[PDB]
Symmetry: D2
Subunit: 319 residues, 4 copies
Amino acid sequence: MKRIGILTSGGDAPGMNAAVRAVTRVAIANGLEVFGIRYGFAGLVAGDIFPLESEDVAHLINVSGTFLYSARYPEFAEEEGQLAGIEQLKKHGIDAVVVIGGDGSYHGALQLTRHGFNSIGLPGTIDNDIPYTDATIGYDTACMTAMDAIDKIRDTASSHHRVFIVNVMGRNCGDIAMRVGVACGADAIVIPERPYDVEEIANRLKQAQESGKDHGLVVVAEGVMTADQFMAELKKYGDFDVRANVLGHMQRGGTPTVSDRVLASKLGSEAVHLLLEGKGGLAVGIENGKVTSHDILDLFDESHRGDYDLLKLNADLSR
Amino acid sequence: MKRIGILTSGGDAPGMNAAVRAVTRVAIANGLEVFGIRYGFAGLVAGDIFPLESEDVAHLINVSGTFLYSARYPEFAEEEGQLAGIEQLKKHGIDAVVVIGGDGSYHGALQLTRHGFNSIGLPGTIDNDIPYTDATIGYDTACMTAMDAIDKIRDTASSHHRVFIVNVMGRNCGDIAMRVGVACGADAIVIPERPYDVEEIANRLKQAQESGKDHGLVVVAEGVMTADQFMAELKKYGDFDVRANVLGHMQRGGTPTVSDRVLASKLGSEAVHLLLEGKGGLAVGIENGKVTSHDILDLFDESHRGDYDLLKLNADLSR
Amino acid sequence: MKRIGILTSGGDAPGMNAAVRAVTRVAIANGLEVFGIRYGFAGLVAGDIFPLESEDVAHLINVSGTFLYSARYPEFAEEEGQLAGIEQLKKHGIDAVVVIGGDGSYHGALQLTRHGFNSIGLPGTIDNDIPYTDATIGYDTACMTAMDAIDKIRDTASSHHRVFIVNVMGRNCGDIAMRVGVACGADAIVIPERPYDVEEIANRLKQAQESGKDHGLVVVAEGVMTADQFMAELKKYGDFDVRANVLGHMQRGGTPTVSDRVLASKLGSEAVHLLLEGKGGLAVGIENGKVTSHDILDLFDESHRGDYDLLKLNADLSR
Amino acid sequence: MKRIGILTSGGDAPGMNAAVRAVTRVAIANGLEVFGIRYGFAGLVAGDIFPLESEDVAHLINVSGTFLYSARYPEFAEEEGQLAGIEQLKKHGIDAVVVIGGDGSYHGALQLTRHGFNSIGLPGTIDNDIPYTDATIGYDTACMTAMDAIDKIRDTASSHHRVFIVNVMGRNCGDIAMRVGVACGADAIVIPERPYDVEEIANRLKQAQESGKDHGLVVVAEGVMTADQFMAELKKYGDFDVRANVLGHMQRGGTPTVSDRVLASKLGSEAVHLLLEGKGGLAVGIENGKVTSHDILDLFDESHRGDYDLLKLNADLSR
């Protein structure tokens, strides 16, 4: 193995750039040549591939987004795109690929591996929705973005004795909602993985109101329903002074946190090392607070488990 | 004059607390006793009035919201509420009132003044929509809140070559939209005070796309239409890769900026000084970069003028 | 057990308030009465003890510092202070105490336990210098504070092709320095736990300069030497364009991060639960990414192990 | 006039990039060709001059520092460097120059103008120390950087009933200190332009202590003395629980605020317009809240006047 490729795929996340940096620099420290692949698997098929020198990854560690760009490509799942991407890989002498993205992009890493181009999946997504990892790159930053936004909501809610219903991101995963909900002392948190009871939430808010609390907050994972939809259901059970906000795509951006930058650096390094020892078809992540890797095949049979105990904890904390 | 009251009215804004602090401390430095009035004119009528000692305004300068609370009161405009509030004022020996709020609350300051309780209006609102002032307390902070959020939107937009349509607050005023739009290099800014042309905006975005720009941004004042509504109109004129976000009530909260804290302190001090020299029925603000005051009556005949030249400037800057 | 006390001891840290909140609310949810103890063990001896109602811990989760205050007390280690504190405990009917602080305060938790007042140590310190825990409350926030500050240093360094030597906090622990160093792409990191070589660092900086890098950064744990002292040594080995900054006590403050707020909430809850099951003399923390507890006695025989592999990682990343 | 040059000179400041952007885009909108000049007057003499296309100023508005770099050049004041820079200007067909920097760099703009290359000075410095302007680009951001840092200091000070002495930047100007001091409720502010009295400050702190205040803060402009030096003098007049911090070069960096980005955009545009109407030897800035320009010669006879009334205001606010 002499040359490696890097691509970012799926929805961008803060810290992707730190991962590209880490892969590039650890690879160059081990005698490898590095190539950037733009627009994910889309540019792979198009042949948007270029040499990445060590100097080319300067001033990136603190930068959000992906400087390589990301773009969706359905035909890469099919043999048409596979072969076209592979021909492009061969054209540039690339032997192996690091794929930075969500578990969706891991499919492409596996297909590449099966065609003789060993590949590693690296978790870059805000959602933390990948099996066998407790963290994905971008997740901590999204949580901070949402927390800071909801802190501001709590300021205005408190001045006015208002209840807010707030959508956070997550896709079909409730991890952002639970973590941000606890961090922002939400009265209730509503997620796809665990049952919720609108009437019970209404009762919580009523009791809090009676106890003199000057604000209310329900954090609703976007995967359940919109804030507007939840607010409408809530209003059936009581007369509340309530507003609904949807935080939106700000959760995908911003300079990556200390945790995201370090996580991206650890995982990028691990990916290169796995490749150096002749491994492929692996996804790297965090288990039991340490860096681990698994066959991508094994992830496709499993589901992400979030920290659902946070709901029980917040049940005590919300008064 | 021996005793003064303070109330916050209308939608809260970052820096209201710094204003209460400034009024309280400058009044106490001049031998006056100070009383807090909770829930704006609502608590005035209810008699929610208490002594504010100098120690009671510690640890407030950096705190968002209003610790006195704000709450709407229609009946205070009428003679029913006026007399009830006045009786409450007399009950606590209060001679004068500082009213911190939007130009809507200035009505109450004037009515109070007409009844022998000299009052000063102090501009506390994020919207910057008050005649004869170039700044209101909360405006700079809202602009920062919106800028930081839209910076994050620009990060994710750029990774994906996406156009974003983004609503910012302002009520019926375009000041936030223009200032934030320029600060975030929006392709176009859409405000209530000046005509806009969806087809022309579409042409801007098309040209930018052709020139290789990797993101688009239209900042739409909430006073024009929703981001969803603008996006729908835009899609008529071209096929864009576009999303729509509404920033929401986060713009009302957050720790006040250096400018908001200093502005609140200057204006609070000015209010007390005006009262000391036996003035009433005045609103304080900023003109030609300095602190000024005007008869509240004069504001009711005028309209806020924003810096519309920013649209012409941004016309050159957006490529 | 019917009544519990809470105190914060040692240097304050962001998230202490979230811990008091979590202890108070989880205790009240389990039928316990809660009492605040001000000024750590100092106020314990003075008898500065008061009832903490559930409403009294509202609007605290996002607040830095400790609202109970912290203050040093040498005589509490001695039997004089112990007995005096115990008499005060008995005076208020308190059966058990949660001690939020550094491993130094754990001594007091143990002494209390030995006198029939079961106590739990909870790690509140920015330094992450406690045995058997991978995280202390305040650590993530300090890391963010330092990262954000050093990002700004990197901006100005880059405009001017300057090298910066920067002290971060940590006491005698290098954890902040390593984590922040990696997050800010330092050319070198200098810590008390592992050898460093000024000449080698000078060589790194020289090579980087030759390669066209427009900034330099050495992160020096305060536990090694001052930035001024390091800069002086560095200047012996080369002629550098260099400045030295000491970040200072800002690292101790600021609103706690999402991780610190959740960590404080988990650990506060765990402390209450341990007490409910009749345990005492335990310190709670994080091992293998999960909440654990250990006999305080066992910590006194051990040393904190930091993630020193970060130095090897950063060796590759720094070019 | 067909071609214009842009350079940044002196200490960098957040918003310089927004100014380069604004100059470049407004110039291109008016049919001019634009050239970047690197390393200030140093690269001008070296001939580090290149074409700046409109696309080349994308993704700069939010970026700190100067992407063109800044670097000191003594010989440009002399006729040796002047002629060499001029020959370089002629080599690239450049007719006029926008100089972004401190009033020190304005000397170079004037010399250029005298040699037939009309030039405009644009205020880029954090210090706000330029005659005939109430604001310089970078000033608001530095104030925010210092405010946010000192807020954190106030958190830790309050937990411990500590007094902090804190140096902020400013060079020989007290503007940052006064503005930040008021914004952070300093007990006292110490600046070069107005007398201070250490004994009186000590008395303030003593009285505050007696009144139950849980923190102290003295903001000392770096132009007076170091925080260490002030603390030493203070300790003569009383026994205080005191620490000293120097904020340092973080004040020079960070993403520019909404005000700095808009200010840079207005002033950059104004510079281009002045050049278009055949003007030269002018410095642009803010007076009476509006954009103005003056002969550079006139600035050399005047001194910056800061808002010293803030000291009298803070005298009332500090209790």
